[PDB]
C-alpha cells in the first residue's frame, strides 16, 4: 500500500518523551519493548530516573529492567488471533513511514473480529487502541467529527512522536553512531593522506 512520509527527528527530546508516554500508556498493554531498558530510555530521552520510574514504569519493574509486560505472547496470540510483536525493533522491521501510515490507517470494518481493519495492514489483528484520540475513522479514510480527543493535526503529532520514540527504540545508537562516525572518517581521511603520500614517495 501507499505510505505517508514522516520526517522523524531523533534529536527532539520532547517529541521522544511524548512518544514514550504514548507507548507506555497505550502500547505496553499488549506490546513489550523487552529489548530495551527503562534506564537507557530515560538517559537517551533526558528523563530523570525518578521521573521515569514515576511516569513510565507501570509494571513495578526497576529502572534497569527491560520494558517487559504481563501479557505473555502465547496468551495474546490466543486472544487476538495473532501475537502482538515486540515493538523495540519494529521501526527497523517496518520503517517509520510504514508505522506512521499504519497507526493512522485504522478504520471501522464490522466484518473484522475487532470491528476494525487497516489500510496499511489489511486484516490486522490489532484493535484500534488509539480510537479515543483519533476518533471514529471510516472509509479514503475520514474521521467522524466530534468523536476523538484530538483533531487530525493533533493526532498526527501524537503518532509522529510515538513513531519517533519507536524509531529511537529500534536504533538507540544512531546519534552516538553519527557522532563517532564523523571522527572515525576524519581520522581515516587524515590517515589516508599520510598513507597516500608514503606510497607516492616509495613508488618513485
Amino acid at each position: 500500500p501507499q505510505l505517508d512520509h514522516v520526517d522523524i527527528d531523533l534529536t527532539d527530546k520532547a517529541a521522544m518523551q511524548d512518544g514514550a508516554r504514548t507507548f507506555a500508556n497505550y502500547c505496553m498493554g499488549c506490546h513489550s519493548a523487552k529489548f530495551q531498558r527503562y534506564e537507557r530510555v530515560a538517559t537517551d530521552l533526558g528523563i530523570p530516573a525518578d521521573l521515569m520510574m514515576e511516569k513510565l514504569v507501570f509494571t513495578g519493574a526497576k529502572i534497569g529492567d527491560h520494558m517487559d509486560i504481563g501479557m505473555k505472547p502465547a496468551d495474546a496470540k490466543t486472544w487476538f488471533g495473532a501475537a502482538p510483536p515486540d515493538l523495540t525493533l519494529v521501526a527497523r522491521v517496518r520503517g517509520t513511514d510504514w508505522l506512521y501510515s499504519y497507526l493512522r490507517s485504522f478504520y471501522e470494518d464490522p466484518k473484522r473480529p475487532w470491528g476494525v481493519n487497516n489500510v496499511i495492514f489489511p486484516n490486522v489483528g490489532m484493535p484500534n487502541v488509539l480510537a479515543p484520540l483519533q476518533g471514529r475513522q471510516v472509509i479514503q479514510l475520514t474521521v467522524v467529527p466530534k468523536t476523538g480527543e484530538l483533531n487530525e493535526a493533533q493526532f498526527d503529532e501524537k503518532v509522529k512522536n510515538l513513531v519517533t520514540f519507536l524509531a529511537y527504540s529500534a536504533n538507540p545508537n544512531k546519534l552516538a553512531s553519527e557522532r563517532i562516525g564523523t571522527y572515525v572518517l576524519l581520522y581515516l581521511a587524515f590517515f589516508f593522506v599520510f598513507a597516500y603520500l608514503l606510497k607516492r614517495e616509495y613508488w618513485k
Binding site: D18, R21, N25, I47, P48, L51, K55
Partner: peptide, 16 residues
C-alpha cells in the same frame, strides 16, 4: 516540563 509531558493517561478519582 518533562513531568507534564510524561503524565500517565489514566486519571483516578480518590476519596478525599
Amino acid at each position: 516540563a518533562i513531568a507534564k509531558r510524561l503524565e500517565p493517561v489514566g486519571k483516578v478519582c480518590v476519596q478525599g
